[PDB]
Amino acid sequence: GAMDLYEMSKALAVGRSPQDIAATSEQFIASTFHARSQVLLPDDNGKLQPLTHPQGMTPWDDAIAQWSFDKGLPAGAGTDTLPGVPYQILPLKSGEKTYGLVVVEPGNLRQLMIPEQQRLLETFTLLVANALERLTKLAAALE
Amino acid sequence: GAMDLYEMSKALAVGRSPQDIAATSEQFIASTFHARSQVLLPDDNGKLQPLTHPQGMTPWDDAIAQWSFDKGLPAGAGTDTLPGVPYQILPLKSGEKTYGLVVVEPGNLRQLMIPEQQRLLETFTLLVANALERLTKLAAALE
What we know:
By secondary structure, chain A is of the alpha+beta class. Chain A has helices spanning 4-13, 18-33, 62-71, 109-112, 115-142, and strands at residues 35-42, 48-49, 75-76, 88-94, 97-106.
């Protein structure tokens, strides 16, 4: 919806932890894009977590997810890497830096892949990435 | 244009100072929205700077600008506060917090006020606000 990006931005602004940001992002991406989703974040070593998909999502390839994060490039539907899977693997990027990934599995892939929806989803991932960037850089500043 | 938000996000991601963010925001808002613009930022006391408009912009009311920043509410065209002026005064907000303002004076006010353009401009101000929030909170973390 028209107001969803603004409402998510309000919820992201008060997030205090990566898990807060992940939960908020999943709630809003699920509602706005009629999809199940999972945010994946790097650990100390740069390896994405969690490695276990949630009930209701089809399992994705962990190593292709890692590839998407490492390269800052999408995979899954709409790309030339795993073009046939029923989900998208999207980097959460601010500038050239990738702070995480979101796996998005819609109820209706033809609906999610409408170009206008793809452009809206890109704006969502940019706002999520900005929130992750803020928390990561602040924690580093202080710890 | 379709790619302008993404291109501005890349430029905002590498900004190192509020002045960097202000210059980038003015460049992209000017180009995308066919407008002159000025970003105003609070000083130590919460008073907006600069107090001097640039050549090519019509002077705005400094106290109404301060009102917009203090209340986190827009003024100027499209609002019930100074509805008749040929510019908009827009808070740069992330969540409930306002980090600055942008004054936008278009070459063609009827074009800027097209609702689709207004919705795009709101997304721009959200990305600018996120950049200002990141720099402000990081500087505080370190200084």
